[PDB]
């Protein structure tokens, strides 16, 4: 006989890690015999509707308003409700707390299935499952490819959460050529783990580039000879703003799609520059950091690590910054590892020549 307590009210959420959550609550009318345990229960989006959770104390006794929970799962959408439990039995659940996210780890599982074979002429077709959105343990999910024909391993930083597949294109590829690959995950946090080495085979000039110095005609590299060549409508010279080097790229390659433009790593000596309005031309040299033209989707740069070298990657959807910038950070990222800038690309356009990430090599400096 007698009656269950009554439902709590006013739960709040006092803090939150990882893996736990703070609870506070108020008590509920508890019909005349005194509460003896709470219990807590949580929901989530992956959790089959309200279940049980674990706390710390492993018991909440019935004179304690506040209580942790534990075991939860990082970077996902969490509500808590509170039971009243006394002598009689346990009264109604409280209302949930306000929906709160439990904070962000690095990832534990590898993609699963990872696999690959087929495309077109001279590409290799690596392929995974995505890591389902309960699984990622944070913002900022992506994936990192190595693969290799060898000893050095080549890799890529893929930065989409729902990405399965990569494509390297490069005519070094040897058609239906062994290749091994390995896949792993990452996130704002850090590096997940690789998953196992597999085998996968792959499918059965120069790059466009546009280089410019005020008062003398654009130059842009023949794809065929890979020679610089002048502006073909003899004047133009340099422009003003990067989506202007954009354009400029689209005029001088309109058989290719032309989709964003970045400067390459490296300058280059270019002969045979002829100044703007003069009826004759006598060359002169010039070292500039030409554009490379970017065309159709963008796909990371692949990276080839050498066994004594070490491959990173940072991002960041907060800035959309330059390449030159960004180049910065991966230079000095690595003076701080006391090693050296060995290569470095750009990843997540977020703009014409602006990017929300950078991976990058570093190898040891080398001397005697």
């Known amino acids: 006989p007698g009656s269950p307590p009554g439902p709590p009210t006013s739960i709040h959420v006092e803090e939150i890690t990882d893996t736990t959550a703070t609870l506070s609550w108020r008590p509920g009318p508890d019909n005349h015999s005194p509460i003896t345990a709470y219990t807590i229960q949580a929901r989530t989006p992956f959790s089959l509707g309200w279940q049980a959770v674990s706390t710390v104390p492993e018991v909440v006794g019935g004179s304690h308003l506040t209580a942790t929970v534990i075991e939860l799962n990082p970077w996902v959408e969490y509500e808590f409700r509170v039971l ?30 990872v696999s690959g074979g087929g495309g077109s002429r001279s590409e290799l077709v690596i392929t995974w499952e995505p890591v389902p959105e309960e699984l990622q343990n944070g913002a900022g999910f992506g994936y990192v490819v190595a693969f290799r024909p060898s000893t050095g391993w080549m890799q890529a930083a893929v930065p989409s959460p729902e990405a399965s597949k990569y494509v390297f294109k490069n005519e070094t590829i040897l058609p239906f050529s062994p290749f091994q690959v390995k896949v792993g995950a990452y996130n704002n946090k850090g590096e997940g783990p690789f998953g196992p080495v597999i085998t996968i085979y792959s499918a059965e000039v120069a790059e466009p580039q546009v280089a410019m110095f005020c008062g003398k005609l654009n130059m842009h ?14 004047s133009k010279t340099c422009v003003g703003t990067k989506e202007g080097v954009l354009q400029y790229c689209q005029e001088i390659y309109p058989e290719l799609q032309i989709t964003n433009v970045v400067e390459a790593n490296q300058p280059v000596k270019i002969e ?22 970017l065309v159709g989707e963008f796909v990371s740069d692949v990276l080839l690590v050498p066994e004594k070298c070490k491959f990173f990657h940072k991002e960041r959807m907060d800035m959309c910054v330059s390449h030159q910038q960004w180049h910065g950070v991966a230079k000095e990222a690595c003076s701080k590892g006391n090693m050296v800038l060995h290569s470095y690309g750009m990843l997540l356009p977020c703009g014409i020549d602006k990017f929300h990430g950078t991976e990058y090599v570093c190898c040891p400096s080398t001397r005697p």
């Open 84 to 113: 009243a439990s006394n002598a009689v039995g346990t009264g109604e659940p409280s209302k949930p707390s306000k929906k709160a996210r439990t904070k962000d780890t690095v990832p534990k599982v590898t993609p699963a299935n």
């Open 221 to 234: 590299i023949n794809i065929q000879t890979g020679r610089w060549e002048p502006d073909p409508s003899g």
């Open 272 to 293: 045979n520059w002829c100044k703007k309005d003069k009826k004759q031309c006598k060359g002169h040299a010039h070292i500039v950091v030409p554009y490379k033209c």
